[PDB]
């Protein structure tokens, strides 16, 4: 229920998505171990190697 708002550094950017070229898949790593790594998506421009903070950490990836 209550999650810590957890921050995460990105490895390789997986190219644009989102049907308008608006969303970027980024594959974050959770700052505490590099073994735990989910693929997620942000909007706005990325700069590989930076830090972004997940308001809730694990929801879904882009697959049908």
């Amino acid at each position: 229920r209550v999650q810590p708002i957890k921050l995460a550094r990105v490895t390789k950017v997986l190219g644009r998505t989102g049907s308008q070229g608006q969303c970027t898949q980024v594959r974050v790593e959770f700052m505490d171990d590099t073994s735990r790594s989910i693929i997620r998506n942000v909007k706005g421009p990325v700069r590989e190697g930076d830090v972004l903070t997940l308001l809730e950490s694990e929801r879904e990836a882009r697959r049908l």
Partner: protein, 102 residues
């Protein structure tokens, strides 16, 4: 014009084959026109592997696979893009596409 040498179907020495039914739209197709696809998908959704093996009651658990045979009418095989419309001379090969697993 006759388009294909076999008539889209793999029957030669018969008169009649069984009708089976399409998976998504439930349409009556013969067993040898139907586009078959056998799926050996792991049931664990490989993103969710290192979240259950730490929650496991073992140290090395063999995760079960899921074995579901799909088969399609070709009006829903083309729309779902499991087969693709091909050129008139790249049609005469029955070899499957490559795998490309890693």
């Amino acid at each position: 014009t006759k388009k294909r040498r076999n008539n889209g179907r793999a029957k030669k020495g018969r008169g009649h084959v069984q009708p089976i039914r399409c998976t998504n739209c439930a349409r009556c197709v013969p067993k040898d026109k139907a586009i078959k696809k056998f799926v050996i998908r792991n049931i664990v959704e490989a993103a969710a592997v290192r979240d259950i093996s730490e929650a496991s009651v073992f140290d090395a658990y063999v995760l079960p696979k899921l074995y579901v045979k799909l088969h399609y009418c070709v009006s829903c095989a083309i729309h779902s893009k499991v087969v693709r419309n091909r050129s008139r001379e790249a049609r005469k090969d029955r070899t499957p596409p490559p795998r490309f697993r890693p």
